[PDB]
Design an enzyme around this catalytic site. Sequence first.
Site, mmCIF file in Angstrom:
data_model
loop_
_atom_site.group_PDB
_atom_site.id
_atom_site.type_symbol
_atom_site.label_atom_id
_atom_site.label_comp_id
_atom_site.label_asym_id
_atom_site.label_seq_id
_atom_site.Cartn_x
_atom_site.Cartn_y
_atom_site.Cartn_z
ATOM 1 N N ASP B 7 95.126 -1.567 -11.042
ATOM 2 C CA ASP B 7 94.552 -0.662 -10.047
ATOM 3 C C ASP B 7 95.670 0.189 -9.470
ATOM 4 O O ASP B 7 96.744 -0.334 -9.174
ATOM 5 C CB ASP B 7 93.857 -1.431 -8.918
ATOM 6 C CG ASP B 7 92.521 -2.024 -9.340
ATOM 7 O OD1 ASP B 7 92.286 -2.188 -10.547
ATOM 8 O OD2 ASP B 7 91.703 -2.336 -8.453
ATOM 9 N N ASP B 122 78.154 -4.120 -10.868
ATOM 10 C CA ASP B 122 78.345 -5.290 -10.015
ATOM 11 C C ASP B 122 77.024 -6.040 -9.945
ATOM 12 O O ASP B 122 75.972 -5.437 -9.726
ATOM 13 C CB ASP B 122 78.786 -4.910 -8.601
ATOM 14 C CG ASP B 122 80.250 -4.495 -8.521
ATOM 15 O OD1 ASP B 122 80.957 -4.580 -9.537
ATOM 16 O OD2 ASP B 122 80.697 -4.120 -7.419
#
Lengths: 232, 232
Positions: B7, B122
């Site tokens: 990230d 998700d």
Amino acid sequence: MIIPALDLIDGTVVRLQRDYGNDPLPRLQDYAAQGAGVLHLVDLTGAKDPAKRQIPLIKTLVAGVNVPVQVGGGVRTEEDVAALLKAGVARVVIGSTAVKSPDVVKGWFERFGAQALVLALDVRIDEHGTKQVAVSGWQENSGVSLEQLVETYLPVGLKHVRCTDISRTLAVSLYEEVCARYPQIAFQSSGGIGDIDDIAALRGTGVRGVIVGRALLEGKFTVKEAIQCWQN
Amino acid sequence: MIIPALDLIDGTVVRLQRDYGNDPLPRLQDYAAQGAGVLHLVDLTGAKDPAKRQIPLIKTLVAGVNVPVQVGGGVRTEEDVAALLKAGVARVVIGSTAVKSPDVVKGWFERFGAQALVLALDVRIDEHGTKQVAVSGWQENSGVSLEQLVETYLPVGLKHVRCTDISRTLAVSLYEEVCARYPQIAFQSSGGIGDIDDIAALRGTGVRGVIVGRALLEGKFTVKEAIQCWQN
Ligand code: NA
Ligand code: NA
């Protein structure tokens, strides 16, 4: 609810064979006396030879309790279903014929109503994780998944499905998965109850009915204890 | 395969915040040197403000390794997708926009091809056991199941899905279930890898890609060890 079950061969209570006597009625009556709301009988004699269907015995047993009984065992024709209903059974359990002739059985739903019929499926989880339907523990998979077959009967109002895992005691993803997918169906679990903890393990899965057979005959727990556990 | 992931916030490698320095390229290069076939970058800066998309950095990183990189982070428009591809990324990871505007994203599949797009979902398992899609860990469920959304994109040739369980480390029914249902899709798992045993646990589930981020930064195991474990 807990669904106490007996298998019958020529009037004899048997375990899947172990012989438990020729007193099915007092046994069933005591199951009901402990609070069972539904009972289950399998006519193993009829399953082997439809001409030998134990209708007179079934008639006596039903008449002798105050609760609905679902009865299965080689139900092959419309005439089999009608004969059982007529003898007083509440629901007829349809196994292999529901896999083999869905268009015919869909017609039975239309004639008798979904409240009168239970579809009994044997399921093997294959290497890929698919729920494969098979017509018995001793036959290969039939080439249809549990989901595909359930979805075949949803158009005629399917309400009751009895599922046995024949690839596996329970102490449950399988039940969680199918119950979540079809919340309009009341699923029953069969098999894998060896002790009281196996019933606890099914709590929360979404299963409506828990069939209990051999553990009661073996004296592992009583119907009353099973119900107390189930209701928590 | 194992998919090592970083990230990035304004050029900085971060953990989900913990700061791990401003050397993303040598890290990625060492991941590739250990045998990684695919890498994953999340542009957290771009996710917060599309105008600040770290294209120049992404361009350098891609150019600096010999393997395809999938990149996500606030991909909202057709222009976002095209800009990333143009900068040299192999696959664009689409998250919330795939939940919110499926007809628009289905158009992107037609323009760019399914080999260029990864749908990132998700998933929360609710009380009933349904796989509920949500656009982030901090938002309520969106009112669509994983299966429904996957089936929405199958007509435009969906091939790649990245699934994070945000209701749950892994040491797997969820992955087994969806992989079995859609064998024509290559699913990636993300999250829940705290140690090497978490990777072993995904073996056999049917998952194709295992995204590994923080465990590598924390030095729990190496990319080489992860690959050895995965390939068994
Ligand atoms: Na066969
Ligand atoms: Na909401």
